[PDB]
Structure 1
Amino acid sequence: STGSATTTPIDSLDDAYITPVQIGTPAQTLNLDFDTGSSDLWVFSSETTASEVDGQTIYTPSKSTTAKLLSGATWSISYGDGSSSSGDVYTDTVSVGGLTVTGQAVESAKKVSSSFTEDSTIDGLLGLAFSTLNTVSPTQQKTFFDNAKASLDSPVFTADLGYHAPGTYNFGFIDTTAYTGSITYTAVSTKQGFWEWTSTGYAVGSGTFKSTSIDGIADTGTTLLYLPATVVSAYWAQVSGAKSSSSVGGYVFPCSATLPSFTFGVGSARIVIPGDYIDFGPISTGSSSCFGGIQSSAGIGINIFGDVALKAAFVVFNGATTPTLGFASK
């Protein structure tokens, strides 16, 4: 089997991407944030504290003839940005772009933190990291990909995120028309439950490539590119007037600037992030100070190849017995 679904930016900055997901019978379509950095499929629901729902579409398990309460199961998750959610668990039928999993754990939120409430466009998350990170207790549950894997034509999914435009998540096949050149594959460590890999270096603009190992995660659920302070300083030094602002919480730059590209290495191959991808616009409405899309990972504890990086590539998440990651230009 295979599936194919369009993923759409939630706003003009590509702050996140939503993908429609069918849950239950009859189908209830919710727009979920596909997140290769976590492993829980959770939704706003009829059980979510009413004051914490503000415009989201909810899953109502009582209206699904295939929903079953997973007795005794609870979940609770905290994300790197300080947001959180928690609740109980149903199993139900879940379909993504024509690919159907029966008995998928659908984690129903009883509580969500303010950032989730305040974002009316995201109805929940669909985790695509390794199932070892799943938070369901006392019986850990499998991700959608993990459940689908054996049925897929090939045990893979691909992320093809757009810049200020829709893109595609495919399951079970590689669309050879969606990228240019070849896909370069690179080793993955699953030891921390992430799609963790090691970039071979970077370049800033038309500058020379610096060969250096950068361990990080391919994370579709993180907006920006978070790299070591040395690398980030080298990038922003090429932008006149750019500075790290403690009050804002990262590097800012004059909105009048033209940003240089940023290249990262995948083995001997190179992925080029155009300068415009690194612009996250005014820090506040009307400001001429703009927020940078490349930021320091110092104090995160891990480097994160988030959407800014991933949207410059066609990315293969290869879930073979020994997982690997593939990157192609597009």
Structure 2
Amino acid sequence: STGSATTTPIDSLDDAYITPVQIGTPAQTLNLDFDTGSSDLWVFSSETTASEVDGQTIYTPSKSTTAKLLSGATWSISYGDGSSSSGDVYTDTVSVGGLTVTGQAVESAKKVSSSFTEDSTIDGLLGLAFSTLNTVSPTQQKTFFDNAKASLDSPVFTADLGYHAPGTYNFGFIDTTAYTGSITYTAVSTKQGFWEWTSTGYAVGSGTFKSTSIDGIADTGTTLLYLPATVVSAYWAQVSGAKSSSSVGGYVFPCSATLPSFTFGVGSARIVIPGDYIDFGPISTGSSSCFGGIQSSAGIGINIFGDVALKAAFVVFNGATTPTLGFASK
């Protein structure tokens, strides 16, 4: 089997991407944030504290003839941005772009963090990291991909995120028309439950390539590119007027400035992030100071290849017995 679904930016800055997901019988379609940095499929629901719902589409398990309470099961999660949610669990039928999984764990939110409430465009998350990170207790649950894997033509999914435009998530096949050149594959460690790999280095604009190992995670659920302070300093030093602002919480720059590209290494291959991708607009409405899309990972404990990096490539999440990651230009 295969599946193919379009993923769409939630706003003009590509802060996140939403993908339609059919849940239950008859289908209830929710727009979920596909997140390769986490492993819970959780949704706003009829059970969510009413004051914490503000515009989102909810899942109502009582209206689904295939929904079954996973008795005794609870879930609770906290994300890297300080957001969180918790609730109970149903199994139900979940379809993405024509690919159907029966008995998928659907985690119903009873409580969500204010940041989720405040984003009316995201109805929940669909986690695509390794199932070892799943927070369901007492019985850990499998991700949508884990459940689908044996049925897929090939045990892979691909992320093809657009710049200020829709893109595509495919399951079970590699669309050879979606990228240029070849796909370079690179080793993955699953020890932290992430799609964790090691970049071979970086260049800033037309600058010479610096060969240096950068360990990080491929994370569709994170907006920006978070890299070591040395690397990030080298980048912003090439932007006139750029400064790290403690009160803003990162590097800012005047948008009258021209951003250089940023290249990262995948084995001997190179992915180029155009400078335009690194512009995230005024820090506040009407401000002449713009927020940068490359920021320091120093306070995080891990480097994150977020949407800023991934949307510059066609990315293969290979769930073979020994998982790997593939990157191609496009």
TM interval, shorter chain, is: over 0.9
> Matches of 2:148 and 2:170 in 1, distance apart?
12
> Matches of 1:324 and 1:257 in 2, distance apart?
38
SS at match of 2:309: helix
List per-residue Cα deviations over 1:104-136 (Å, max 9, x = no partner). 000000000000000000000000000000000
SS at match of 1:165: coil
Q: How many pairs are equivalent?
A: 330
Equivalent in the alignment of 2:208: 208
> Matches of 1:117 and 1:177 in 2, distance apart?
38
List per-residue Cα deviations over 1:226-271 (Å, max 9, x = no partner). 0000000000000000000000000000011110000000000000
> Matches of 1:64 and 1:249 in 2, distance apart?
44
Deviation at 1:21, TM superposition (A): 0.1
Q: Percent identity?
A: 100
List per-residue Cα deviations over 1:115-170 (Å, max 9, x = no partner). 00000000000000000000000000000000000000000000000000000000
List per-residue Cα deviations over 1:177-212 (Å, max 9, x = no partner). 000000000000000000000000000000000000
Deviation at 1:299, TM superposition (A): 1.3
List per-residue Cα deviations over 1:47-103 (Å, max 9, x = no partner). 000000000000000000000000000000000000000000000000000000000
SS at match of 1:178: coil
Equivalent in the alignment of 2:72: 72
> Matches of 1:160 and 1:257 in 2, distance apart?
28
5 Å-filtered alignment, 1:290-309, equals 290-309=290-309
> Matches of 1:157 and 1:3 in 2, distance apart?
9
> Matches of 2:275 and 2:63 in 1, distance apart?
47
> Matches of 2:290 and 2:199 in 1, distance apart?
27
> Matches of 1:289 and 1:96 in 2, distance apart?
40
> Matches of 2:203 and 2:221 in 1, distance apart?
24
Equivalent in the alignment of 2:312: 312
> Matches of 2:218 and 2:257 in 1, distance apart?
28
SS at match of 1:220: coil
> Matches of 2:257 and 2:316 in 1, distance apart?
33
**Gap runs ≥5 in structure 1:** none
> Matches of 1:3 and 1:130 in 2, distance apart?
19
Q: TM-score, normalised by structure 1?
A: 1.00
Q: TM-score, normalised by structure 2?
A: 1.00
Q: Which stretches of structure 1, 4 residues or longer, exceed 4 Å deviation after superposition?
A: none
Deviation at 1:172, TM superposition (A): 0.1
SS at match of 1:18: strand
SS at match of 1:140: coil
List per-residue Cα deviations over 1:23-47 (Å, max 9, x = no partner). 0000000000000000000000000
> Matches of 2:114 and 2:284 in 1, distance apart?
19
SS at match of 2:308: helix
SS at match of 2:31: strand
SS at match of 1:51: helix
List per-residue Cα deviations over 1:264-300 (Å, max 9, x = no partner). 0000000000000000000000000000000000010
SS at match of 1:136: coil
> Matches of 2:132 and 2:112 in 1, distance apart?
22
SS at match of 2:150: helix
> Matches of 2:255 and 2:59 in 1, distance apart?
41
SS at match of 1:280: strand
SS at match of 2:149: helix
SS at match of 1:190: coil
> Matches of 1:34 and 1:243 in 2, distance apart?
32
> Matches of 2:17 and 2:249 in 1, distance apart?
23
SS at match of 1:150: coil
